[PDB]
Symmetry: C3
Subunit: 512 residues, 3 copies
């Protein structure tokens, strides 16, 4: 058992945590988000967190049985307005994105004004291409800052953006593009990762050789090298954006209008809504990572996954804080890249994967010992349960026994973090996700009998009793597959698909 | 021959108290506020309590008969599907919305608001996937199954204009209506079942579509499951398409004067004309008429035995009853199948509180004998209504004596497709009825009798002429589809300053209105 | 120095001026419209002047550097609703347009109800053609009243209308139509001006022979003479409008959605204006610069093919709910007394003409003007080139009989509305001077040789604007780079008008010296 460190207790000049200082406060706050009278809490949080064009009347409706979950159905809003405009109107010169390029000398800060102008130009280009509200736009982009714009531009005009990981081959890209039935694709000529060149344009051409519906391609000049260009179909990002105004009006979108499609690695196109997903990600980033207005969040993931969707673009920007876009690899040029970045930009939170931590552990302790890293307050892990060795190395070297280790468990269909300790309230056990988040009422079911186990020291499958705002709403044009995968195995519950155990203290352990 | 309201309509025997009553002066006091120069306040208040608005309105009414620019609450936005399904589903998802009385009595079942809303959302998602945008036209060729309602509201959910065609029409009439409405999506069934007989609906659709080049997508509902021809690409199954869609669909925020539906006349030969009805005014009129004329209450079970292919099915089977949040009945059989006692068997089975049928069916049941009706209970009924030609005194007395057992109020209603809702009818809790009389006009309707030759308004009682309306009402027809000149010529030019119903009318000594048939 | 006349002092039964009676009152009012504390004044004026479907939250944002000027971004409204619908609801029988035809015997009044019904029919026709929100519609129309309706029709459904001056040749019309990429063109069979016939449909056919994107043409029967008609492509205005209802719902449009494109006369550039800011600017300018009152009859003798016709014939006067004049003839047809005959017949209270017309009327002699009454006029305005002192004095002596205020106005297509002009009830005028800038305009003089702002009076240089104003142009259509180079690059941090200016010892502004 590791109590919260002094940095997370509001000492040494650090901001006081939102929830604390013990387990009782967390349980008192969490009891309001579930059960009989959670509607008032969720309505207050929704009206406090987001800006609405039209206010809503009903809080929640629907259920698991037919996949008709609804949250704030009567309200209208826009994700791009909540992530860009309302922050640009308040502090245009505040930094929104710290772009850590592949080569450290090319790193620079991007202000909210610059990101908003780029987003508006891209949205104008998309509208000129004929993209309407509810259309699909494919995005095949590497980890550059403009990718964020390419996301928000879609959310600005009501288009549904489908991100494809830049490392995917031509076949997977073709499958996802064909399934989403998009007509516009946004990509780069080449990408740069770890000193290596990714031929994104060549793969895009190979895939589009079998994609009849794609008519317009927008190519970003990331490196400026010679790449083939098909006349008429493909146009340069900069040349097209130079013709458009730096502002574009925001479409007024219903809360249940789809925001993006994310294909799981026939692929499942997971669909998320606008208001519920945005509210869930904003609340999770604010509370689980104890984000504050002047914080500098750093998530070392890729925008082609749900982690990059939630905790690089939508989450941090909805809160109006600085987020980091990291393009390199953890061991380029030297295995000290992460700590050099942290010391260079004074990052306050860090969010990486267990694999990177294990690789850095195998690389030695002569790349972390001589680093300051005093700005960090929270160290997070995402993707797999962490083993004690990596957890302790993370606590001892990355945090210098002074940062809270937040091990989070979630998946693409939950939208945001489901189970994770609150850094200012929960004492952490190495390798445990501890307790569920707001709006999440999870339990353990016997797989053989289907009944719900009661008490502590139990083990079974992990299920959720009631829907939460950021839950996935459907699988794109395959709702029957959605119901079969998530609702049919255990009626009345949402099936995560992972085993879970509850120890004597009530902590939840996820089995790999 | 004057019949006072019965004890069932007086709040006795445990029945709910009437909305308006108990005498004629009470009706007059309420009706005086709905007409004249100071009726804006009453209509604004009624619109704000009756319907749920996304955006509030500022102006109540504008326009007139001269140029056909009638406007009601122009600045407000709302949705008909939200007012008919979503709010009631949020209030009580398990309440029954539709009692589906199938052709075979053993196949009848209840449909809840949740199930209807989910089906409507799936169909709306399918229509959106087909590329239907706001303001588009969708033709509906369906028999009296409950899913037909799920089709109607589906269009109303996405802002499409639905055009219903009666299932008994031939291929030529269906082709004419489809070609005139210029639709690209058609909704239909494989077969229909009525009175134990099979309607080859899909065969007629296939025959008609050979001369309808603009139709690209056909959605076929599997009502019976028998083998019917299916064109690849064009025709898709209802269940298979709806299984791929989510059970929810956001509601389009629609202007008050955005067209709600197109209804073509019953002309089997020639050029049918499409009466166009808007959203807010028509919905308000039908809701108010169903609440007051039939004295509908939240727990009532309204039963109208018309067809959804006509205006009666539009107003008092789907829109009117569901906008009030009550249970409505969808009746698929005929009055004499399997036995001439089907209506009373249905009434006793589902304990319907109100009945709304046509004089022709009542006359047929009269000629079929008294042995089929006199042995039923029928105590749940409080109101018996008649829609169509004025009911003759003989049929009126038979209806009073046997269907209501001299304990139900008989409400003879006069209206047309162009009026949207009931224009002249007695209030059951306030007005004493005479056999064969439409009594007094409804709220917002100020009717007079004009001499057909001189064109002057006949003041006083004991007069006879043509029936006209002085000022527009919320549920009036707004135009004839792409033929506004025909609309003006038919309804506005014959008597300038008045709306021409096209029927003769006589006002007797007591002021009761008697309809004398076509001019 | 000419003090305001008694007619502008609230005497002889004339309405009291909005701003007056001296320069100090004008400066006191104008100090609120510029600086760091102008947001409250602009928000109050926006919420008082226009009707909004949804209220706005932010007042202004953006700047000159990147061409991202924003005004009231979160609000929604409609220009057709503000110009037609609310006035029609308030008073349907009030006259909106006085149509002075080429033949004076064919002149007649158009009520607000009639204009609204015509606009609704045309909007329904446009919707039937498949025109969506944000589409471009070309308008090649002469100075008939229906043209105004057409404009508002494009505003009612959210389309972007691009007006082309009726005297343009086939090549210019083809270039503008091709650049705007429209699919619908609204035109007439023939126009009538000065007793002469303009073959409008012939030029339309010649241009459309090289315009592949146009599919629907709507032809208005102005004269009824026989003109060529292409089957399918061309349809008559009256026959199409007879099939549609006389009402059409208004699209709820964002404040920063484009309202119209106006090409300047290299290749033509399409100046783009927004909805809320341009409408507010024109309404305020018409209300204050011309001292318009609810019962006034404004008369502007410009053409709807230019920015003057856009701002002070259609949008500005109708947004205020007053009567505006659509003049089809020429100043010298049938006789050089046409302007004064029109003024005496319709009792116009304000007049807005070009210096060239005044010079021509001077060359025509005095016998045509000295015997008219003209007592209804209160304001005489000039639009275009700076007026000479001699023409100014002739205008003051004969048109106004030394009892009307002369308003010299300086502006351009990219400003949207009047930038520099005297307030008639507050400012004393000098012959040939634009006096002082309007509300929201903060203009200085920059020495072109050094690029530094000249401080003090009795200086001369180029005229620049420090901060954006609501009615500023937002971009050049599909050529934003050209917009930035033309208006924002030569002097960074300032908007470059492109005209010389001088400031005398009294602080008055003298355009081009």
């Amino acid at each position: 058992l590791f109590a919260p460190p002094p940095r997370m207790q509001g000492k040494e000049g650090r901001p006081k945590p939102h929830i604390g200082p013990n387990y009782e406060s967390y349980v008192k706050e969490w009891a309001k988000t579930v059960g009989p009278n959670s509607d008032e809490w969720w309505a207050a949080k929704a009206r406090e967190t987001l800006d609405w064009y039209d206010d809503f009347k009903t809080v929640r409706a629907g259920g698991f049985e037919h996949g008709d979950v609804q949250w704030f159905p009567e309200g209208t809003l826009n994700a791009a307005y909540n992530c860009l405009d309302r922050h640009y109107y308040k502090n245009p010169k505040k930094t929104a994105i710290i772009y850590e390029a592949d080569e450290p000398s090319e790193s620079r800060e991007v202000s909210y004004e610059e990101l908003m102008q780029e987003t508006c130009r891209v949205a104008n280009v998309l509208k000129s291409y004929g993209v309407k509200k509810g259309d699909a736009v494919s995005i095949y982009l590497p980890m550059t800052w403009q990718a964020a714009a390419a996301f928000l531009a879609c959310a600005r005009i009501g288009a549904i953006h489908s991100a494809v990981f830049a490392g995917f081959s031509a076949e997977s890209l073709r499958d996802r593009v064909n399934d989403c039935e998009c007509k516009v694709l946004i990509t780069t000529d080449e990408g740069r990762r770890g000193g290596k060149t990714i031929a994104t344009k060549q793969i895009v051409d190979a895939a589009l050789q079998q994609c009849p519906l794609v008519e317009n391609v927008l190519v970003l000049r990331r490196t400026g090298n010679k790449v083939p260009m098909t006349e008429g179909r493909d146009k340069w990002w900069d040349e097209e954006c130079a013709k458009m105004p730096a502002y574009c009006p925001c479409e007024r979108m219903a809360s249940e209008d789809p925001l993006f499609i994310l294909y799981t690695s026939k692929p499942k196109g997971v669909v998320h809504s606008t208001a519920g997903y945005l509210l869930g990600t904003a609340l999770t980033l604010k509370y689980v990572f104890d984000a504050h207005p002047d914080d500098r969040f750093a998530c070392m993931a890729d925008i082609g996954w749900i982690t990059g969707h939630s905790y690089i673009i939508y989450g941090p920007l909805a809160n109006g804080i600085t987020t980091a876009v990291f393009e390199s690899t953890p061991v380029y040029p030297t295995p000290s890249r992460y700590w050099d970045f942290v010391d260079k930009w004074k990052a306050t939170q860090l969010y990486t994967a267990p694999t990177a931590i294990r690789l850095l552990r195998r690389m030695g302790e002569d790349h972390v010992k001589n680093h300051d890293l005093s700005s960090l307050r929270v160290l997070g892990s995402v993707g797999e349960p962490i083993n004690p060795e990596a957890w302790h190395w993370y606590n001892d070297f990355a945090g210098k026994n002074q940062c809270a280790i937040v091990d989070t468990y979630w998946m693409t269909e939950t939208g945001s973090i489901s189970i994770a300790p609150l850094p200012g309230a929960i004492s952490t056990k190495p390798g445990s996700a501890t307790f569920p988040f707001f709006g999440m009422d999870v339990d353990i079911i016997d797989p053989q009998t289907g009944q719900v186990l009661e008490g502590n020291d139990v083990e079974g499958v992990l299920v959720a009793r009631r829907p939460w705002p950021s839950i996935a709403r459907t699988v794109y044009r395959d709702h029957k597959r959605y119901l079969e995968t998530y609702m049919k195995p255990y009626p009345g519950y949402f099936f995560f698909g992972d085993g879970a155990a509850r120890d004597y203290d009530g902590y939840m352990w996820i089995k790999g």
